[PDB]
């Protein structure tokens, strides 16, 4: 046909301005191509600046861009290959395979920009997702068709937590899973890809029931922004056209907001609170609403929010809290004392913690665990200042029991054996609720609190207590 | 299916008639469309905040009318709109369909049906931006709003036309207490007395679509969707839609208020509306004020909330009750938006995670939760009757002031501590369990006599259920007496005391 | 059965929307670019007759 | 009271020139001199619009503004003053020129390329904009009809879209 | 020939108007725009340039188009002034909000007037007995002076000011004015109803109070100028009528809030805490016109809303210096059950002098203040360590200060909606005698509860006796 040629007029960091002629203006978020010596550069039209000039966001590095270079309009937004062909392949933001295994022979390439399915939702938030992690299986149950937050700052252990999530779930899940790796470590992605390869999760010459998306934080802001969108395109195509339950996996959903703020700083927008993009809520909602159960298929989301400067009140983590059925807040303070995973027991929360879905027994156990932990945190100040002696017998017993539960919350992970030094444990929901019910009644008050450290079920607690009392003492 | 056929024919005939008589010449042409907003030259006769129709079909609204160009906020995505696209001014300020047919339906910010249940039957169209009633047309709030939860009814009563803010941290029960208030109205809405019927309007601004589906199904189960109204402003929806949806829901509630009916509109979130309006201002080139929030977030909140009022008998004696929310960050009540909204609402309902994990299931922070009309807007059987029910709040403040941290002075201090602990034990209420005033009053009375000798604090949970069952059996005469008459007589108080003593004996 | 019939109405509306693409393609290949121009021109003339 | 508002923002110079002319005379003479200026500018492209760059000292801007002063002082009226003040201000001088012709066009010709659904160009030279637009449209549809690229009728697609969506 | 202008820009609450004549309207002039909903008034705030003036809309900017005919009134906003305004609700533009017909006032003065000169600054130290124990003890109010009610949201400012209207407004004798600035419309309604019941507003006869409202539902310009309208009414009462005036402005902070609100869009660089640069200037221009001159006295009571309960916010912090008697309502003391919520420490007044209230009054107030200060210095030591570790004298001081803090709470007549106890009118002499008796240790045996929510020391004794009787 007739190519739509545009001329580069401004290159502002990761943002490129393109000027067209009369009646050839690409719409917002259209994909634009420039034949750079290293390959092709994709530009997404962020704004129309008028006078037939469009403000665009770069999918790759803007070095080597000369003003006036020819710009080709693809005729639509960025299209990523979709279908079972992409399963087992590693794809960047653009859509080309980066797994060096040849081009993807996908029959369709759905655009990364799609409208939410509106009110095609279901209130099926009643199926507990058994992950094997005793703390989340007790305090903040995960939804099979819902969204999991998995908050945390630097360190804390969010990456090992999500990796344990894949290891326990995607191995024996009835459907496909998609990992996006939004602005994370490329070495982490390589290691986790190798880990799935060893487990047979991604079999190159086989079923390979998992599709991988990458474009980690080494990529420019536009990439880190749109890699979540392309992973969502993969997930939505598997969810609707294939009718399969999909295990989404986003290693850092915050990096999308970080990239949005980065491009907004160059988009000529007055900054929002804490210097974020003003549209942070709008783009964040547009991102999260593509992750919905929908009439056909279902999605599990599983996010991982990075809180800047360990500030839970930061605008992006505050905004993402609404778009999450269950959250798992990892606090660095708990990480200091060594209870791992560092999930905050009384900051994770889950909509699934209701007696109708839970069963009024596990719900009561979780409520009493929260009771003990909240009392412990309330009394920490006078415990440090005065000590345990000042408290009455009931308060002293409550503090000791809460310490025991908080130690018991630690659970070894199979993906963290090199760190713990102890083989990982997968605790069933019934096992952990029975164990914590037994703990709450005081049946294990005589057992030292250290026996609850890096253990699984209550039988493991008894075994560790016996070993410490006999072999160690 | 003749219905799609004739509706298509009628719509296309209307389009033909519009084309035959349009003579639109001063219509605008888009210069620069940004992120969900477009600047358009032309429209020399455009009214401020007047709806417009872009050539692509996306509706718009005119906040800033600069000389030459006007800023149009888009009520949808900016996918379709491009530079040089024609914009068609609707000629009328943005409005929302209003009437009794909106009941049982879920609508977006503009009022279009999004529940897939067919077209909306509206008795009329009311402006999204409507001036609040003046000093005289209002009336002092005296008719209570039966929330159905013990703590909020006893300590921070809400009345018809009152504006009570459900301020709290993240997932601390804000929408939960909103839901119990929502559901408790089924007792009167299933009757015939319209003066006691209280139609409901939920504002889901900034909430996710899955949460709204949870909401609508929950209302469906407990026979509540028929009298409730869901105005959903999804986060994925354009920020102007989030900004406007509470205003349109306020107009919808004002329809009931001006027609002699009582409406309860819960401005749930409204901090998401605040940040959406911050986005609107920060891409509309408006310089911000504090923490990048625009200047008129206070004016916005106040103008939106003041539309909720109790009209006088001359104006039909209607009422419009507001239940706004504030999502504080880390319990920061002393923040700009929180204290701003608190200065608007006729009292606030504070919820923190501290009491939520401490056991208080309503998470009612009796300290910072205060209602601006204590004696009024409360059930007569629950307000003072025996006196202690009136200074209930002062007694709670005393219990907080001399809690377990304070030294146990003497037997009087021990009795006061026991009374306070038993009382806060009683106030816990399970979710989706609206407890009526005819059942609230005996429990509050039992919290003053027979409370101290409770067998363990944990057993008061089952003690409450057993006391309800006791009041149901051969004591329903007392329940219906306190439900119908409203006030409590001396003989009624004696009978209640005798029943309490008989139960505590067992 | 009620919400099954509601879903049936939704599905028939969706299938009509699906057939809308064939409806559009019917006039896409139809040499319609002459009669439509004359009709819109005479409609404009009638519109400006009043004005 | 200028006929049309340029709303400032690089358009104030054209309005100022029009006011200065309308004070006494030369609504046209200054304008054909300005048109001659633009014609001379486009006659030498590398020498007529590259010279309007911001990176140019005031002395060389003055030398340029004397350079356009040529051909038996075709520069007449207040146009010379416009070049003089543009030398000490924003240099490049095309859009305010177009604004000047557009202002005079609204002053004395009053034409606009409307048609709503019609993607035509029915320019009309008449101040009474009531019925002559119909005659212009009839003439345009009669003779010419070069492109007629309507780009799909919007009423049909709009009506269909609202019909399927309900 | 009227001066005509055309609307050029409508940016939120401000409207830009261009006049095609060199006779531009002066700053603060009133501009009239004919609208279908009624009449819209615009107040000129800036001269942008090129015969364009930047104005602030008095009402909502609903339905404004670029090109609306704008009429210049030739002067600032004029409101009715005189006895006709008594018993009538006044809008920001002088219109009667209540549909009682037009106001037949023969004088209409502009809201913008020069503050009284330093020569006409007659100042007095007359005591004002408001009947509230804290006020008559620690922060005495001055008749003809300026009284401040500082407090956060939901602390007690509106209840406290309503208590002043009930107490002193009825027995004032002169003409008082209430100016609702950016407040709750329902609050204004209950205020109107309460004055109708108390008889200070007599609809069918003579009323002693003028009603001016700029409730928050009004646009920012109305909230900014309604204080000036009520101020002008009070100034006309003070100067021309030569009568004592009580100018009750509820939450005056809305004026500065609206100024900072319009400043951002007025092309003004925001000041600290995102306020208008001129906050001190326009706020002082408003406050100084509230003063006692040689022609009359204005006993103004102004509530001040502190954002985020932060007393260091620029608006209230600068407002402090404009105020004679200061009453600070902190959330902390209210959280302890003291419903008046007046923090006894920072609640200070210039009248607290031995030469004004008497040597004994000063001594009693000072002793109370040192007792509360010793209490406050012992917050943390008691909370984290324990009251047992304190010395016997320190324990006695702590318990006496607890009794005093309870005794500060007083039943307000308008507060029966919350307390449930009938309001009490504790006299100045009664308050002084009760507090000097308590400070002497005469009632150390009486429990702390008996001082809670009571009037005089006789009420304390009665409550203690009742408590002993019910305890048995
Ligand atoms: N199951 C586990 N056992 C022991 N340590 C863990 C576990 N999970 C996470 N960690 C800890 O997490 C920390 C950093 O983890 P990671 O989440 O990768 O950092 P970041 O959140 O900055 O990406 C390490 O110090 C490591 O000890
Ligand atoms: N009676 C109750 N009151 C309040 N919250 C409850 C109750 N019972 C259970 N909950 C839990 O507390 C949470 C309330 O949070 P919610 O009101 O949804 O806040 P948000 O809507 O801001 O997340 C729910 O997820 C629910 O699981
Ligand atoms: N003297 C008092 N007696 C009883 N309650 C009071 C008293 N003062 C304040 N309160 C409580 O504090 C609140 C005062 O609110 P109000 O002063 O009207 O709001 P604002 O502080 O914003 O003006 C009321 O809800 C009331 O319960
Ligand atoms: Mg990481
Ligand atoms: Mg909620």
Short mmCIF file of C-alpha atoms in Angstrom, two decimals, chain A residues 134-135 338-341 404-413 427 436 452-456 464:
data_model
loop_
_atom_site.label_atom_id
_atom_site.label_comp_id
_atom_site.label_asym_id
_atom_site.label_seq_id
_atom_site.Cartn_x
_atom_site.Cartn_y
_atom_site.Cartn_z
CA UNK A 134 1.55 -21.78 55.73
CA UNK A 135 1.38 -18.05 56.50
CA UNK A 338 14.93 -13.61 60.47
CA UNK A 339 11.35 -14.91 60.18
CA UNK A 340 11.25 -15.82 56.53
CA UNK A 341 9.22 -15.21 54.40
CA UNK A 404 5.71 -18.71 69.09
CA UNK A 405 3.24 -18.09 66.24
CA UNK A 406 5.49 -15.47 64.65
CA UNK A 407 8.40 -17.92 64.73
CA UNK A 408 6.10 -20.63 63.32
CA UNK A 409 5.22 -18.35 60.40
CA UNK A 410 8.70 -18.96 59.00
CA UNK A 411 8.63 -21.67 56.34
CA UNK A 412 11.48 -23.07 54.23
CA UNK A 413 11.11 -22.69 50.47
CA UNK A 427 2.43 -27.30 54.24
CA UNK A 436 -1.99 -23.24 64.53
CA UNK A 452 8.99 -23.12 65.51
CA UNK A 453 11.86 -21.59 63.50
CA UNK A 454 12.16 -22.83 59.88
CA UNK A 455 9.67 -25.69 60.24
CA UNK A 456 6.60 -26.94 58.41
CA UNK A 464 12.69 -29.96 66.19
#
